[PDB]
Amino acid sequence: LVPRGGHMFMRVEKIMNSNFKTVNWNTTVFDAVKIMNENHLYGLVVKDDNGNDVGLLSERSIIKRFIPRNKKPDEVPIRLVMRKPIPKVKSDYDVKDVAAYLSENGLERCAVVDDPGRVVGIVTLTDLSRYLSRASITDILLSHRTKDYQHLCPKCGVGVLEPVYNEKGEIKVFRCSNPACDYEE
Amino acid sequence: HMFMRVEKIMNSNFKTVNWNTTVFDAVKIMNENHLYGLVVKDDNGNDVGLLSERSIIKRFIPRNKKPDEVPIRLVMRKPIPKVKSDYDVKDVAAYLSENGLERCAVVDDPGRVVGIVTLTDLSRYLSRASITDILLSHRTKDYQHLCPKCGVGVLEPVYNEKGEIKVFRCSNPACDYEE
Ligand SMILES: [Fe+2]
Ligand SMILES: [Fe+2]
């Protein structure tokens, strides 16, 4: 953490966490959370088996998408829980622009990618709190409580994955909203 | 102003759940209400704890059990994190940061929980530095679950070969409490 002092403007790249951790998408919720608890890191980058960055696992994603399934954490691969596609902003974004992105999506952290598209870090509300106005911080906090990230289907990439519940309120599957797509997970 | 008592900004319209409610049912309540902090009461009306997202990630997931098989009494922050209603927001901030919390209960003189106060509530009256402090402490520190029997030891996780929490045991050698 490079000390920089408060400034109205600030390039995300300069304040993001370059020492982020990446986990495989088949990692269980149990094993992923062990990593979070151990490192006191509540945001992990998720890659598929070919090295593609496919999502981001956060605390809220676990509370919103894992718990409702009502299964043991060692029985659910994080691919079914992570925010996907991976939430992200460009490394040259000002903190203000990053704030707007997080708020628009109800997030409190996202990945940062460089021009060629590589994930170079993770930026959180904590990171941003040193530069954002108090009003901007409250906005992100309120948006995170009230809004949920829109997860897109990995099969057609266009449809929105919506939850399908049963009589117990359990999430049986998340189903692609795309009429032309028949995907469920 | 340089002053503002928490009672004025707290949320007096909060949700309370029984301590035998499963993590599954408690989370469904939180998800449906978009309120990620519940006050927990026992079967005798006593406020015994506060269930937060972090308490679930730290004290539920590691047990590797279905959400409907674990009662929140074993997950919630306990003893209940709290501040008096006459506390200045700066004092509430110090309390949260000292405890690695982002929210806590507010009690009146008699001692009953009258509301819940969150970082979002405080964000409108705290300095930028204090807000950052609370965020840093919530990430770096975790609430200390003081032992209810000896009152001085702290309940520590006891793991099996898989790294699963079997029980939380008091750190006090002179004490034999565990849950
Ligand atoms: Fe689809
Ligand atoms: Fe003890």
Report a brief summary of the structure.
The structure is a homodimer. Chain A is of the alpha/beta class. In chain A, a hairpin with a 5-residue loop joins strand 2 and strand 3.
Structure description:
It is classed as unknown function. Keywords: CBS-rubredoxin-like protein, Fe+2, Hypothetical protein, unknown function, Structural Genomics, Structural Genomics Consortium, SGC, PSI-2, Protein Structure Initiative, Midwest Center for Structural Genomics, mcsg. The assembly is dimeric. Chain A is α/β, with parallel strands linked by helices and 185 residues long. Chain A contains 6 helices and 8 strands. A 3-stranded mixed sheet of chain A has the order 1-2-3. Chain A has a 3-stranded mixed sheet with strand order 4-5-6. The longest helix of chain A is centred in the C-terminal third of the chain and has 13 residues. Chain A is globular, with a radius of gyration of 17 Å. The N and C termini of chain A lie far apart (39 Å). At the A-B interface, helix 2, helix 3, helix 5 and helix 6 of A face helix 2, helix 3 and helix 6 of B. The complex binds fe (ii) ion (2 copies). The site of one fe (ii) ion has 8 residues of chain B, from loops.
